[PDB]
Amino acid sequence: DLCFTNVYADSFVIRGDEVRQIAPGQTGKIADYNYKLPDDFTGCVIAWN
Amino acid sequence: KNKCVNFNFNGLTGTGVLTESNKKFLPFQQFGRDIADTTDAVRDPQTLEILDITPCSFGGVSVITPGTNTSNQVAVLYQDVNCTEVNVFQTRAGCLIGAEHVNNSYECDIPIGAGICASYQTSQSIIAYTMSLGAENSVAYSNNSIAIPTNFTISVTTEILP
Amino acid sequence: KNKCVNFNFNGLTGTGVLTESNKKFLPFQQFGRDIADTTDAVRDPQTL
Amino acid sequence: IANQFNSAIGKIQDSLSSTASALGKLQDVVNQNAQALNTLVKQLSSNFGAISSVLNDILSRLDPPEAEVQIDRLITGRLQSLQTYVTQQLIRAAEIRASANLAATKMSECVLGQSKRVDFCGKGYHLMSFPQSAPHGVVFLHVTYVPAQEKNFTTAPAICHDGKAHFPREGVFVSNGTHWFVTQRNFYEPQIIT
Amino acid sequence: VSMTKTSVDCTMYICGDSTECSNLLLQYGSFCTQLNRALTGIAVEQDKNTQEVFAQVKQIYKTPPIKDFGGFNFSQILPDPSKPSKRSFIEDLLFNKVTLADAGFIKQYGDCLGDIAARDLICAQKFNGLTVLPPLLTDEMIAQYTSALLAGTITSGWTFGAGAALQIPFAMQMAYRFNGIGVTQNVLYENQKLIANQFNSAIGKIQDSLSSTASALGKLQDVVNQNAQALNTLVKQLSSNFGAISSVLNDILSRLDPPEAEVQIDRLITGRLQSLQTYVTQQLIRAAEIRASANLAATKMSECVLGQSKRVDFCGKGYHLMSFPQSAPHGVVFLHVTY
Amino acid sequence: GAISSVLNDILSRLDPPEAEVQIDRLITGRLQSLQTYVTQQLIRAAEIR
Amino acid sequence: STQDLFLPFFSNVTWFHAIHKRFDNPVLPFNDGVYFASTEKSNIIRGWIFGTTLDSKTQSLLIVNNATNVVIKVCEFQFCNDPFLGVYYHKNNKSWMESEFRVYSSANNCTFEYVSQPFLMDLEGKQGNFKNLREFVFKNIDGYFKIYSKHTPINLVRDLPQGFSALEPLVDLPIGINITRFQTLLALHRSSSGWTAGAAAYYVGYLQPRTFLLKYNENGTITDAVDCALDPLSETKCTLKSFTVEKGIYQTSNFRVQPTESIVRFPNITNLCPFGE
């Protein structure tokens, strides 16, 4: 029903233990160090094996 | 256009009226907003035209009726509209459907507004009359006339205050 | 009965006083409510 | 006057026993007190944005981690109901106190004294007022001087006797058409102009 | 005397043209009934406050065409039949120096639809549920309520408020009101050509005080301003995000599920209800200010217009003789004759 | 209704995703306090006037 | 004050009957929900078939009564164009007993089945007045079919009586299907297409999401109800929360204009996004 203006895909491969770290407000070697999400992040996270 | 519909522009859903406008959007601008921050205008993404969003449910509704013990016949006063939406009569407050115009100006029985008052009188229905100001008296005035009572009365006026 | 206790009827917990009433519940009805929407009456599920 | 006054006291019985809407001002004071107390019970049936309105439901369903999300919606909904209600009471109490200061003004000046204030204690020249006990208020019985039977008279400002104007000390100049008379304003008692 | 009768639709203001919001709003029960009861309670008493001031006699009085006043010119206070509304020259200046809304309380839907004016204050409130109720006593009638009280003051003196209208000449009316303030009545007739020139020049000073100086009506202009700004503030209340992710009801209905929207829409409903509980609080306190002034205006009508005020400096500086009622926007203007 | 009354505690504990749940409870609690207080002042000012 | 799917007062309901030359079992919509009301004397209303397309291509509900058990089945039915259950050959030893079972042809993939207690229904024919009033509320929201049953004796020849009856829920059926169209069974008699029909009546009205008021007595039975969308008189009853409107004027709401149709306007593009890339 709702559609979006500027869709950007963030495609990369990490360890399976650190997928929950991809969230607005988390830490880790992925979240805190190189791939950080904003505090006002309005988006979707799609991950698979 | 010109009908209250359920619009959907770029995912934004709502109830509004689409009309043409003289507003010209900038090429990076899509949504027009108001003081109340709601979307007042959108832009058609297929063809280049500008459409406003007018909110629906317009016109106040007054309920002019006596008690349910007396009768169930009612008169509905529609403010801020003419008699188009809907014994049809137009008053100074709005369209009044259900009350017959009576030229006899009586005392105000039901306070309505805009100098109009109603009552349930005589086949009995709600009548619509102009609110009378009272019994008009013409004072016979001159430079050599005076009215002085030869007799009076003692009336006990009851004023009741909390 | 007739004492302020901590009742528990079908999982609904609260503080109230249990007295007899002349109200007759419908067979599909269990809880009676008030103007304030709180439970004014319950039904004993073991005996009627 | 004793027959006109005692018949007017009998008209108070016909105005209160037959017509029950004469006390509708103080009935509205009782009604706005009784309905707002009855409205405050209806305030408890609002879900307040939570999943239910009843405090006993959330205590029986949800954990205190998940109940403080829901009970604090009920507490805020019941407090804002009271902060609206105390707002409705203080504005109503400011209306009654402004009327009670008006009632204390109509007791000191209108009952305990004679009111020179024109049409403040009802229509007519006010003589005295009688205090009567009323539910959450007072009812005054204002004794008024109202003229009933009047006539049209010929008047004049002054009179030339010896070339000098004569003005009334207290009263007016009236005439029945032949001779000029003197009387007061609120009653016609013709006297010789002396 | 009166104020702007406002009946805010709390069904439309909280949930604007929404079915899913109105299904959540009707769970709140008696919130929209208790606020509409207070606004109706204003709408009854402000018509009552206009009733207690302008309508204190059951009979309507008019002046005879034969004018014998003794040099006193009363053409500036009596209404003019040449205008479509029977108003005096003073009452025409009072209705023009106060800024009101558009002509008539009926603004069409096509006037707001066919022409969307840039920053139009009246239409934008009406699409937010803010309806302005018209008063019971129109300004065409209020100019005739004051005309009935003025014709009784000129022709009948002060006896029209204490009973039936009993005529007395204005030369005798001014002589007997001097005895109320302690002046012997021989002062009047020795200077009747002088006092009539001093009074008619003072009526000409009312024209120089109202037409040139537009800030003399700033008290009743502030009554219109505090009514118009608070109605315009209530539109600005809808732009507040209320702690939610957005202020618009149509955004959350287009983004979030009803599991996640009841977290967000109930923040909008509480933010709009508290705004209405702010506004009804601001109206009832303001209505208590106007009613205390309308009870003061009814005190300055019964005692100061219908009678002679023995109260010193209550009706202006000087020994008060009589006062003239004039129709004003949501109020009254008195013309106090002082010694 | 929040976890604490102090504004400086939530700014030192929670992320702005989780603080807007908590600080907006403090803002609403302080504004309704000011909404109650101005109500108490205007009714008292109507008594003095 | 409650808010659910309700039949509005003074609404447009249907006019269908059974008689010895009008026989009506039409295809009726059920977009939001339907209300049922039948004045009967001879137990002619036997049941319904609730389906989406009324075919074996979809899953359908079949609530019937074969004079022994209240049969409620959710299967893949072979839908016949005219379902009926007839009573045969009365002339000697009547007994009012059935022969055929013509509501469907075959049923497979049965997911829900309800067989009630065996009872002996009096299927005898009557003349003159209708002595039974069977009213039902039919709605399927969130996969939870709510039925509401009420039976009261009436004395009626003609048009639906002006009265009130609080309908009570009998059972709760977890059918889990989509219902868009439905029909109604009727009984057939003759003193297999030369049969006739006994005197019957049934009324169908569409449920709408309206707001009612519910005035309860001391016993708990609803005495009277008021729809909030009839007129501004009845909306004043919803605002004042009293059925006796006092003598005066109460501002209820604005003149609401419902939207006619849903308008969708999206950008025009035919290329899919690179989900494979």
Closest approach of E287 to chain G, Cα-based (Å) = 19
Contacts of E43 in chain G (CB under 8 A): 251
Breaks in chain F (C–N beyond 2.5 Å) sit after none
Q: Does G277 reside within a domain?
A: no
Q: How many residues does chain C have?
A: 48
Selecting from C23, C24, C28 the residue whose C-beta is nearest the C-beta of G169 gives C28
In sequence order, what are the beta bridge partners of B43? Answer: B50
Domain tally, chain G: 1
Structure tokens at D15: 């105005």
Chain E contact residues (CB < 8 Å to A):
254-255
Helix, strand or coil for residue D186? coil
Distance CA C26, CA G168 (A): 9
Write down the H helix ranges in B92-159.
none
CB-facing half-sphere around the CA of D114: CA atoms within 13 A: 5
Which residue on chain C is closest to G217 by alpha carbon?
Answer: C23
What are the φ and ψ backbone dihedral angles of E283, each rounded to 5 degrees? -85, -40
Determination technique for this entry: cryo-EM
Handedness of CA E228, E229, E230, E235 (dihedral sign): positive
User: CB contact, 8 Å: C35 with chain G?
Assistant: no
Q: Does G271 reside within a domain?
A: no
- Domain CATH code at residue G127: 2.60.120.960
Q: Does G129 reside within a domain?
A: yes
Whether residue B62 contacts residue B91, with contact meaning beta carbons closer than 8 Å, is answered with: no
Closest approach of G239 to chain E, Cα-based (Å) = 6
Distance CA E221, CA E329 (A): 9
In sequence order, what are the beta bridge partners of B119? Answer: B127
Specify the amino acid at residue D124: G
**Cα separations (Å) of E198 from E174, E193, E201, E203, E325?**
14, 9, 5, 9, 20
Instruction: Measure CA G182 to chain center.
Output: 9
Selecting from D4, D154, D185 the residue whose C-beta is nearest the C-beta of B144 gives D154
Residue with tokens 């109503």: D92
Whether residue E280 contacts residue E38, with contact meaning beta carbons closer than 8 Å, is answered with: yes
Q: Which helix (H) or strand (E) holds E273?
A: helix E265-302
User: For this experimental structure, what is the resolution in angstroms?
Assistant: 3.0
Cα G188–Cα G192–Cα G193 angle in degrees, nearest 5: 75
Closest approach of B129 to chain E, Cα-based (Å) = 13
Contacts of C23 in chain G (CB under 8 A): 219-220
**Cα separations (Å) of G8 from E18, E92, G208, G214?**
20, 53, 7, 14
Containing structural domain, residue G242: 1-254
In sequence order, what are the beta bridge partners of E331? Answer: E328
Q: Does G268 reside within a domain?
A: no
Best mutation target among C26, C29, C35 (most G Cβ atoms within 10 Å) is: C26
Of the candidates G162, G138, G133, G163, the residue with the CA atom closest to the CA atom of residue G150: G133
Q: Does G92 reside within a domain?
A: yes
Specify the amino acid at residue E275: S
Write down the H helix ranges in D1-156.
2-16, 24-42, 55-61, 64-108
Distance CA D140, CA D145 (A): 16
Q: Which helix (H) or strand (E) holds F13?
A: helix F7-13
Strands G70-79, G104-115: pairing is: antiparallel
Structure tokens at E151: 């014709």
Whether residue B4 contacts residue B56, with contact meaning beta carbons closer than 8 Å, is answered with: yes
Distance CA E263, CA E245 (A): 10
Torsion of CA G167, G172, G176, G180, to 10 degrees: -20
Query: Chains E and F: how many Cβ contacts under 8 Å?
Result: 23
Which residue on chain G is closest to C24 by alpha carbon?
Answer: G219
Q: In what order do the strands lie in the sheet with G200-206?
A: G16-18, G200-206, G34-40, G132-141, G144-152, G168-173
Distance CA E235, CA E241 (A): 13
Contacts of E159 in chain B (CB under 8 A): 147
Q: Does G106 reside within a domain?
A: yes
Contacts of B10 in chain A (CB under 8 A): 3, 5
Q: How many residues does chain G have?
A: 277
Q: Does G272 reside within a domain?
A: no
Whether residue G27 contacts residue G119, with contact meaning beta carbons closer than 8 Å, is answered with: no
Selecting from B7, B63, B110 the residue whose C-beta is nearest the C-beta of G263 gives B7
Cα E46–Cα E1–Cα E132 angle in degrees, nearest 5: 45
In sequence order, what are the beta bridge partners of B117? Answer: B111, B129
Chain A neighbours (≥3 Cβ pairs under 8 A) are B, E, F
In sequence order, what are the beta bridge partners of G168? Answer: G149
Write down the H helix ranges in G39-141.
none
Instruction: Measure CA G38 to chain center.
Output: 9
Q: Does G120 reside within a domain?
A: yes
User: CB contact, 8 Å: A4 with chain B?
Assistant: yes
Distance CA D73, CA E28 (A): 13
Specify the amino acid at residue C10: N
